[PDB]
RNA sequence: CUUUAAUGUUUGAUGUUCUAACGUUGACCCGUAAUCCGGGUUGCGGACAGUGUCUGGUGGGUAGUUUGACUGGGGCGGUCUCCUCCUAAAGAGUAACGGAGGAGCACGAAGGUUGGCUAAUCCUGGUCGGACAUCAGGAGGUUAGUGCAAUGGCAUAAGCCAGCUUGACUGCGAGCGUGACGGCGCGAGCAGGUGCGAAAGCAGGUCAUAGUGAUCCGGUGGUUCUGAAUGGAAGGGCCAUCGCUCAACGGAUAAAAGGUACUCCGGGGAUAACAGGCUGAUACCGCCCAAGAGUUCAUAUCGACGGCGGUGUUUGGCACCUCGAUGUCGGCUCAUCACAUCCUGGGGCUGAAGUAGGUCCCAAGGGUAUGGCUGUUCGCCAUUUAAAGUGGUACGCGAGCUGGGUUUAGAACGUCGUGAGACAGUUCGGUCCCUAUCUGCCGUGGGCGCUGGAGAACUGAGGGGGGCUGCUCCUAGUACGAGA
RNA sequence: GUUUAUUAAAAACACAGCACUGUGCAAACACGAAAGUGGACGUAUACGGUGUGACGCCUGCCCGGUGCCGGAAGGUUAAUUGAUGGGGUUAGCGCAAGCGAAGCUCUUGAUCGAAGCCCCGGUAAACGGCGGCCGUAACUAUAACGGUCCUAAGGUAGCGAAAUUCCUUGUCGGGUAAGUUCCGACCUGCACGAAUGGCGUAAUGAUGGCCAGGCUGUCUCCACCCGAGACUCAGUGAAAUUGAACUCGCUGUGAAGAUGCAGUGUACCCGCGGCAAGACGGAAAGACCCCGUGAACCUUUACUAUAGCUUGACACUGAACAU
RNA sequence: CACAGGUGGUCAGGUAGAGAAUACCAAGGCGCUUGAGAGAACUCGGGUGAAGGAACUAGGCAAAAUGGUGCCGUAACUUC
RNA sequence: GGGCGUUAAGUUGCAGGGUAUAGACCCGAAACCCGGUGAUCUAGCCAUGGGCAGGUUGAAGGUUGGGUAACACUAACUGGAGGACCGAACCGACUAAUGUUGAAAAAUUAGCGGAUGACUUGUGGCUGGGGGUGAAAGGCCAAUCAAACCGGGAGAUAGCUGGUUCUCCCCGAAAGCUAUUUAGGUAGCGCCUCGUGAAUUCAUCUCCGGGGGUAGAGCACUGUUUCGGCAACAACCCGAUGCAAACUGCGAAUACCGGAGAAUGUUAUCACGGGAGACACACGGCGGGUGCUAACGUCCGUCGUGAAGAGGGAAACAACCCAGACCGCCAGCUAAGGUCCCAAAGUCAUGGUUAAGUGGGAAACGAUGUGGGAAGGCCCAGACAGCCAGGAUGUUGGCUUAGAAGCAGCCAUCAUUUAAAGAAAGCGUAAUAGCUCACUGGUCGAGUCGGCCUGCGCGGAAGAU
RNA sequence: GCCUGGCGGCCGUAGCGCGGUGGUCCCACCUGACCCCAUGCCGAACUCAGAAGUGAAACGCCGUAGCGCCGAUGGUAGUGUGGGGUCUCCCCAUGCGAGAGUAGGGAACUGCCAGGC
C-alpha cells in the first residue's frame, strides 16, 4: 500500500552532557544535521562533516549560549 | 475506475433502464383512475404544444373523473380538443376553469392485451438489467487485475454488484406489480 | 620467386566400378536318418551396412530433486535491502499487514581555495512588455535558494558569481560514537609531497543523513616475499583493482515449476472449519427532541434531521476451550423454557355509530394447519383455522431414527490449465457402529426406621394431572344506524 | 457384453463401423546388456499406433503458435586436423642492459566439419482457436441485427435456460386445487457446436427425471394375532472400558459448557425391568486446516542428468578411375 | 471354531408338472450338543385389518399387486 | 606513532563439568536402496477335459404352385439361424431389511441380471515388482498395492510428540535484541549459576552542573477554522474565536547523564573464565498505535503480580488488595477486610440522610419524591388559587382562494374605546357561527412563584432448567 | 566629565517608527581620477590623489510608547510518589507548577585604547 519503511537507529544526540571527563576528543554531541543546534566553540571545535561537535583538549564541558540570536554553542574549558 | 465508480455505473444504467420501463408502463391506458396517464398531455398554446407543465392545469377529482383546470380563460378549450390526438381522444364537457373527464373500467379484450403487455414490459426490463449486471461484473474483473485487488476484495466487490442488481430487479417487479394490480383489478 | 596452366606425384572432396574384408533370416553339401551351430560350395549385397571409442541433436521414456518466508488460520493481494518524518511518554533505543514520502544515483565540477555577491514577493513608474521577461526606485526581510525525499541546518552563509587549481592526495592516527558479530561512522594531530591565499589559514570530495553485496572462485598490474633436488618457471602470498537487482538485498546450489479428492507420516486446538466463550460495530426490540401528514390538528395512526439505550438475536471481530476425533444442514420422534403474545381473557386512547378494526397496557392457563414445488430451513402457491406467534435450549434432539443437501475414492458437462489436475459450478452413483457401569428419567420390588407386636381405616404437609375453543339459537332484528 | 474382489454397474471401459498414421518384411513395433523371440510360419484386402464409437443427415472457417511431413540454397554449429602468434627454459651473445637460435615444452586457435536450429513450403478425423469497442433505430429507448479496430481466422449446419445458464424458481404455454421438478416453446448461449464429433435415431437398459391406472398399513392412526429373542429357573460363561470414588438439581465461578469449586435446594439404605438427555460417553496419537527447509506417486516448454532414437570423425576398412 | 460361507465329477424312483421348477413322498439320511417356564415394553420374521388410498417420502423405499394354457385382439413409431 | 608481544609455570596422570567423532539419553515414522520368496487368491493368456432342465421365435437356403421372354417377384410347405426370447442348474450382483463385540474380516433372507456365449468350469502351465496383467477402476498380483512379501544396509533420518527412576542444602532465570529458506529450531548479546580478580566500584537521598521540546499551552510559522472589516464571487491583509501525530515566536513534572557529600546495604558493581536454561508469556496500572478510547482483541513503552509464591481478603476467581511460607507451639499485636445469625469481633457512641429492599446492575430524557443552602420577582394600593362578570370598533385587515371573516397559507400586526379588549392561543364551520384563552374589574383574606448551588432517592429497566 | 572613532561584553525592557538635533575635530558624504586597483555596464562599489562645500543622506545622540520586547502576585493547566471515584474521564494528600492573559516594566547598560573640548 506504500505506507511503511523507516530509517534505522541513527542515534545523534548529547553523549557528553555538561562538564564531563572530556578525553582527547569524546563527542559531547553527535546531533548531526545541525550547526545551530550545537555550535563549535571554545577549546572544542572540529564539527566534522556530519556536523559532529568535535571536542579537543581534555577538560570539562560548558554548554553555553552566546552571540547575536540565541545560538547554543558548546566548548570545553580546563578542569 | 474504482470498485465504487463501478457500483455507481451499475446503479445509474440500471436506473435508466428502470425509467425506460417506468414511463414505458405509463404509456398504457390503465384504469386511467390516476393522472399518471394525462401527466404528459401537451397543451398546444402560443404556437407551441407546450405541455401542461407551464401552460394549463388538470387533476382527477375522484377515481372516475378528472378536471382540466385551465389557467388561461381560453386554454380551457385547448386541452378540450387536445383530449384527442392521443389514446384519449375523448370529448369532455366545458364547465369553469376545470374540465371534466370521467374514469371508468375497460373491456376484457383489452384486459387480455393489457395483461400480457404489463408482464411483458416487466420481463423486458429484467433482461436489460441482467445484461447490465453482467457488464458490471466484467468491468469488475478488469479492476481486479488492475487495482491489484485480492481474492477477498474482488469477491466482496462481486457480492456488492449482485446487491445493486437485485435491488433494481425488485424495483421493476414492484412497479409492474402496481400498474398491474390496478390494470388487472 | 612471383598469377595460369600441361604431364608427373601426393593428398583431401564428391561420385562411379571392382572383390577381397564384412553381411546374408537365398540355394546346396558334410558333421547328421537336427528347425540350432560350425565348416565347405554358390548366388546376392559389399567396403556399404553394422559395431567399438569420441561427438552435435533429440530425449518426462526413466531417475534424483527444487519449487522461500512474513501473514490477525492458509491462500489471494502485498511485502522482503537503504534513507526521512510521526508513532516514541522533552537522553539512546522500541512494535503493528500503523500514518506519509523517497534511494539502487548525479557531478573533473555540482570538488578545493581565494576574492566578491545576496534573496521571494508586492507597489509605483518605464519602447515594443502583456498575469508573468529586462529597467528604476520603494516596501519586504532567511516567506528565496539547496542536483534529487523528508528532517535538521545554512548570512561567517552550505545559497550565488568569478580567478586559479586537483586535498575526490599517500602513509598513520590521540580519542570517541555505534553495532551480538561481520562491520559502519566522527576524528584533532604526525610524516611525505599538493593547491589556493599577502597572510592568518583552509582543503584527506560534495550541507549532512539514501545511492548498496560479505565469502569463495578467478582476471589484470606491481613485487626479486615464497617456489617440493638446484637455477629458473608454473603456482602461491602481499599490495592495488575488476566480475553477483546473490533485490527472498547476513548472500543454503554454478544449476529448480507444479498436482494429489489415490494419497501417507510426525506434530498443533501454538492454527482455520462446527458448536461454546469474550465483544455487540452490525442486527433486532425499545425510548428522547418534534419539522412535517394527518382537510383543520406534532404525538388516533405515522414521523424528517439528529440523540440514548436494551437483548444476545443476525452479519461480523477475536482465536480462550476441544485437532491421542465435541459427527454438518433439513426431516422424523420427543420435547422444555422465555415473553418482545398469533388466538382466547382484562383494560386505556381512537380519525372508537354499530359490526369490524388501529395502537398501547396487562396477561405465558391452554391452544397455535393439511397439502403442491424444492434437500431445504425459508419462501411462493392451493385450501383451511379462533389462531396458524417470535425466540433460547451444542442454530434442543444420530451411544434415538433418516442420509435428501453437504468434503473421499467412479464418471460426464460448462469453464481454467500445455498438463497432472482444478471449481463456495453442475450432473448420475456412493457401507451411518456401540449388549448402558455412573448421573438422570419411567416403572417396580427388597431392607431397615418410625421405640411392645399386629390387622385395618384415615388425616393431608406437600407433589403431579387438567386448564383450548368454533358455530347455531334466545336475548334481539332490539341498542346503535340514513340505511346497509 | 466389461468394471472399482470388500460403500460407485453408470451417462464409464469394450464393441462392430469410421478416419488418420506408421510399416516392402531380417517390416513397423515390442520383450531382451546380447543370443534370441513375439509381430507371423502372416506380407499392404497384412500388421501396429492413435482418436471417434451402430445406423441416418452430416462433419464449416483458421497452418499464426506446437507437433509432424517435404525442401535444405544460404546463416550458425560437435568431435576431428591444427595454421598462426605468444610464453617458460638455454647454447651462444655480451663487463653489464638485455637479446636470444635449435630442441623440449605451455598456450593460441586459421582451417576441415554432419544432423540439428534459423529459413522456405505443406499439414487440423494433428495439439489446438473461432472476435472486441461497441456501429447506425416509435418518448428515452435499446443496441440481438451488425459498422469500425485488430485477428491465424473470427463459430456454418444443427442445437440451445441443455448431464452445459451464473442472475435462476428467466418468460410463456401444458399438466395440478396448488408444480424451485417435468414436458413444449422463446434465445438474453455468464461459458453448445460439428470424429477430446453436431443433430437425430427404431430396438435395447437391475441407467437419470416426470406422470398415470392398478395396488396396497407408505401414510391418516394404529389394532389384534402366530412365531424367534427380551423376562424367570437350572448348567456353561464373554466384551470394550477402567487414575481413585463416600458417582444429586439448580444458579453462579472457573482453561471461558461442573457429580467434585461458592451459595443454595433437595435426598432413609440396596436391587430388578425399561429409556437414552449428560458423564464433552466407548472406539481410531483428526482423515478437514496449518506446520515440518517430512514422504510418496503423478505432470510439465521447472533443473540436472540418462536408456532409446539420430549426426559426423577415427577404427574393423581394401583396389582403380573421372572430375 | 464340531463356523448359516466355498468346493470339481457321477447317479436320477412315484403323484402332479413343460421340467434337473415346485409341492407331497420312496430308497436312504436327519430333528441342526444348552434345556424348562412365562405369554411384559421393545427388536426380528410373519398373518389379518374398518373408511380413505401415496395424503407417506428426498423418492411409492418397503409392501401390496401381476402371474398359467388356448383363443379373441392389440397404438405411435420402425432399421420392416 | 599504532597493532601484537615482552620478569603469566609448565607438564603428566587420577576424578568430575563441557565439546568433537561415533546410534551418543530411550522408544517411534511415512519412506529410500540391495538380494531373494511368491500367479495354491486374483488379472491376462496357453494346453487338455467337463457343463448349459424345460418352454418360444422362427433368418438363409430348398421343393411345389403362381408369375416372367428370362430374371425380379409371390405364396404355401420344408428348413433350421441368432453375442435371439421366457426360465432351473451354472455364472453374476441392481434393491431392501437383518446382521455390525456377525452364523460370516462382505454373509443371510426376499426380490434381481445373464443363461449356445466376448458363456461357464476342472487339471497343469506362462508372465515377478518400477515389473507383471488390466473390455481401464490404479483395478488385480495369497484378507497386503499411487509400487507385494521376506531378509539385509539398519540403531535410515525424526529442528516433532511422549518418557527420564534415591535424599537433603544454597542461588536462581527467560518468555527479549539482533541474524537466520528463520518464525514451535538455532547462534552472539541480555537475564541465571559457579570460580577468580579488582575499586568507596554500585544503589537510595541531598545538593551542584547539564541538554530536552513530551504534558500543557499558544496560533508568529506550516495547514486547518469561523465572525466581522477596505474586493463589477471571493484570496491577501486587519481585529475578534477555535483545531494539530507528521504546527511551535513558549514550556513543566520528570527521566536521563556527569560532579560532591552522609548514612545504609553480608559487594549489591565491573572484568575474565566452567555450566546453563531461555528467545510461545499472561493479567492489572499508567502513556499510546490499531480496533468501535469493542473484545479474557492486537502491537509497543514502563511498573507490579502470576509464570517460578503458599498464607489472609474479593462468596467461589493464576494475574486484583494485604502480605513473601527454615521447623515446632492449645501464646500474644496487627495488614487488607470485617464486628446481627450461618461465621472470629460493636445489634458500639454522636449527629444527619433514605423509606426505594435504593442499598444489592444499566443511558438520553422525564417528574409538586425529599434534606440543606444563597437569592430574586408579586404581594392588605389586597399577590396567589378559586368564584362573578366583562373581552368592543375600523375590520370579514391586505393578498390569496370556490371560500380564508382572530384561528390553510403569505405580509402586516397599527389605530380607536377603555377597568380591560392580541388584526388573536386552541377547538370548531364549507366559509360564518359558536366555545374556551391572554387580559381587566369585583369578590377572597396571607402568603405566593419559579430559577440557582448541593445531598439522597423515583421512572426509563423485556429472556429463556 | 562632554563629544567622537576603533575593538569587545551582553544580545529586543539593547529593536522599529516618529519628532528634534551634531560638524572643515572624528565620521559622513564630497572633489578629482592618467594612474594602483576596480565595473560580466557604470570611480555605484571597491581603489588611489585630495580641495571646495554640507550635515542633506547615512551615522551618533536626545525626546516620544504608537508597534515590538521583558514581565509578576494571584488563580488556572499539567505532573512525580501515595490513596480514591470512574463508560474512555476525574477527585483527594503532598511535592514540582506552566502557557496565555492582567499589574507593571521599558526609548539598554558596560569595559579597553585613541582623538578633540
Ligand atoms: Mg519425474
Ligand atoms: Mg535423497
Ligand atoms: Mg509461511
Ligand atoms: Mg527520543
Ligand atoms: Mg511594471
Ligand atoms: Mg546532499
Ligand atoms: Mg535477510
Ligand atoms: Mg481416479
Ligand atoms: Mg496425521
Ligand atoms: Mg485456542
Ligand atoms: Mg467459532
Ligand atoms: Mg468447548
Ligand atoms: Mg408484555
Ligand atoms: Mg409447508
Ligand atoms: Mg443442533
Ligand atoms: Mg446409530
Ligand atoms: Mg447424500
Ligand atoms: Mg473423480
Ligand atoms: Mg447389459
Ligand atoms: Mg465395489
Ligand atoms: Mg454395487
Ligand atoms: Mg467416446
Ligand atoms: Mg472439424
Ligand atoms: Mg402427484
Ligand atoms: Mg426444455
Ligand atoms: Mg462439448
Ligand atoms: Mg459421443
Ligand atoms: Mg436370556
Ligand atoms: Mg442363568
Ligand atoms: Mg454452569
Ligand atoms: Mg438400547
Ligand atoms: Mg467420544
Ligand atoms: Mg494428531
Ligand atoms: Mg453343531
Ligand atoms: Mg384397510
Ligand atoms: Mg406427496
Ligand atoms: Mg409431507
Ligand atoms: Mg420395491
Ligand atoms: Mg410381495
Ligand atoms: Mg440370449
Ligand atoms: Mg434368461
Ligand atoms: Mg488352475
Ligand atoms: Mg488382495
Ligand atoms: Mg547405514
Ligand atoms: Mg529408528
Ligand atoms: Mg538465507
Ligand atoms: Mg497537546
Ligand atoms: Mg523519554
Ligand atoms: Mg524464536
Ligand atoms: Mg516471541
Ligand atoms: Mg509483550
Ligand atoms: Mg491479551
Ligand atoms: Mg513454563
Ligand atoms: Mg436492586
mmCIF file with all atom_site columns, N, CA, C and O (backbone and C1' of nucleotides) and ligand atoms in Angstrom, chain C residues 329-330 394-397, ligand 15:
data_model
loop_
_atom_site.group_PDB
_atom_site.id
_atom_site.type_symbol
_atom_site.label_atom_id
_atom_site.label_alt_id
_atom_site.label_comp_id
_atom_site.label_asym_id
_atom_site.label_entity_id
_atom_site.label_seq_id
_atom_site.pdbx_PDB_ins_code
_atom_site.Cartn_x
_atom_site.Cartn_y
_atom_site.Cartn_z
_atom_site.occupancy
_atom_site.B_iso_or_equiv
_atom_site.pdbx_formal_charge
_atom_site.auth_seq_id
_atom_site.auth_comp_id
_atom_site.auth_asym_id
_atom_site.auth_atom_id
_atom_site.pdbx_PDB_model_num
ATOM   1  P  P     . C   C 1 329 ? -26.023 -29.118 12.179 1.00 0.00 ? 329 C   C P     1
ATOM   2  O  "O5'" . C   C 1 329 ? -26.530 -28.798 10.700 1.00 0.00 ? 329 C   C "O5'" 1
ATOM   3  C  "C5'" . C   C 1 329 ? -26.499 -27.468 10.184 1.00 0.00 ? 329 C   C "C5'" 1
ATOM   4  C  "C4'" . C   C 1 329 ? -27.351 -27.363 8.935  1.00 0.00 ? 329 C   C "C4'" 1
ATOM   5  C  "C3'" . C   C 1 329 ? -28.810 -27.767 9.082  1.00 0.00 ? 329 C   C "C3'" 1
ATOM   6  O  "O3'" . C   C 1 329 ? -29.648 -26.733 9.583  1.00 0.00 ? 329 C   C "O3'" 1
ATOM   7  C  "C1'" . C   C 1 329 ? -27.903 -28.793 7.155  1.00 0.00 ? 329 C   C "C1'" 1
ATOM   8  P  P     . G   C 1 330 ? -30.940 -27.119 10.461 1.00 0.00 ? 330 G   C P     1
ATOM   9  O  "O5'" . G   C 1 330 ? -31.883 -27.909 9.445  1.00 0.00 ? 330 G   C "O5'" 1
ATOM   10 C  "C5'" . G   C 1 330 ? -32.635 -27.207 8.459  1.00 0.00 ? 330 G   C "C5'" 1
ATOM   11 C  "C4'" . G   C 1 330 ? -33.393 -28.171 7.572  1.00 0.00 ? 330 G   C "C4'" 1
ATOM   12 C  "C3'" . G   C 1 330 ? -34.357 -29.136 8.271  1.00 0.00 ? 330 G   C "C3'" 1
ATOM   13 O  "O3'" . G   C 1 330 ? -35.622 -28.594 8.627  1.00 0.00 ? 330 G   C "O3'" 1
ATOM   14 C  "C1'" . G   C 1 330 ? -33.069 -30.312 6.667  1.00 0.00 ? 330 G   C "C1'" 1
ATOM   15 P  P     . A   C 1 394 ? -28.227 -27.215 24.028 1.00 0.00 ? 394 A   C P     1
ATOM   16 O  "O5'" . A   C 1 394 ? -27.790 -26.701 22.585 1.00 0.00 ? 394 A   C "O5'" 1
ATOM   17 C  "C5'" . A   C 1 394 ? -26.913 -25.589 22.432 1.00 0.00 ? 394 A   C "C5'" 1
ATOM   18 C  "C4'" . A   C 1 394 ? -25.904 -25.868 21.340 1.00 0.00 ? 394 A   C "C4'" 1
ATOM   19 C  "C3'" . A   C 1 394 ? -26.325 -26.773 20.168 1.00 0.00 ? 394 A   C "C3'" 1
ATOM   20 O  "O3'" . A   C 1 394 ? -25.679 -26.235 19.021 1.00 0.00 ? 394 A   C "O3'" 1
ATOM   21 C  "C1'" . A   C 1 394 ? -24.376 -27.633 21.192 1.00 0.00 ? 394 A   C "C1'" 1
ATOM   22 P  P     . C   C 1 395 ? -26.278 -26.527 17.561 1.00 0.00 ? 395 C   C P     1
ATOM   23 O  "O5'" . C   C 1 395 ? -26.840 -25.113 17.091 1.00 0.00 ? 395 C   C "O5'" 1
ATOM   24 C  "C5'" . C   C 1 395 ? -27.588 -24.290 17.980 1.00 0.00 ? 395 C   C "C5'" 1
ATOM   25 C  "C4'" . C   C 1 395 ? -28.630 -23.515 17.212 1.00 0.00 ? 395 C   C "C4'" 1
ATOM   26 C  "C3'" . C   C 1 395 ? -29.579 -24.365 16.392 1.00 0.00 ? 395 C   C "C3'" 1
ATOM   27 O  "O3'" . C   C 1 395 ? -30.695 -24.697 17.210 1.00 0.00 ? 395 C   C "O3'" 1
ATOM   28 C  "C1'" . C   C 1 395 ? -28.688 -22.626 15.046 1.00 0.00 ? 395 C   C "C1'" 1
ATOM   29 P  P     . G   C 1 396 ? -31.248 -26.205 17.228 1.00 0.00 ? 396 G   C P     1
ATOM   30 O  "O5'" . G   C 1 396 ? -31.479 -26.509 18.773 1.00 0.00 ? 396 G   C "O5'" 1
ATOM   31 C  "C5'" . G   C 1 396 ? -30.408 -26.417 19.711 1.00 0.00 ? 396 G   C "C5'" 1
ATOM   32 C  "C4'" . G   C 1 396 ? -30.619 -27.411 20.827 1.00 0.00 ? 396 G   C "C4'" 1
ATOM   33 C  "C3'" . G   C 1 396 ? -30.562 -28.847 20.348 1.00 0.00 ? 396 G   C "C3'" 1
ATOM   34 O  "O3'" . G   C 1 396 ? -29.223 -29.326 20.360 1.00 0.00 ? 396 G   C "O3'" 1
ATOM   35 C  "C1'" . G   C 1 396 ? -32.534 -28.516 21.611 1.00 0.00 ? 396 G   C "C1'" 1
ATOM   36 P  P     . C   C 1 397 ? -28.710 -30.281 19.173 1.00 0.00 ? 397 C   C P     1
ATOM   37 O  "O5'" . C   C 1 397 ? -29.603 -31.592 19.319 1.00 0.00 ? 397 C   C "O5'" 1
ATOM   38 C  "C5'" . C   C 1 397 ? -29.575 -32.359 20.520 1.00 0.00 ? 397 C   C "C5'" 1
ATOM   39 C  "C4'" . C   C 1 397 ? -30.635 -33.438 20.493 1.00 0.00 ? 397 C   C "C4'" 1
ATOM   40 C  "C3'" . C   C 1 397 ? -30.609 -34.444 19.334 1.00 0.00 ? 397 C   C "C3'" 1
ATOM   41 O  "O3'" . C   C 1 397 ? -29.676 -35.496 19.571 1.00 0.00 ? 397 C   C "O3'" 1
ATOM   42 C  "C1'" . C   C 1 397 ? -32.850 -33.802 19.844 1.00 0.00 ? 397 C   C "C1'" 1
HETATM 43 MG MG1   . LIG H 2 .   ? -28.174 -28.618 16.533 1.00 0.00 ? 15  LIG H MG1   1
#
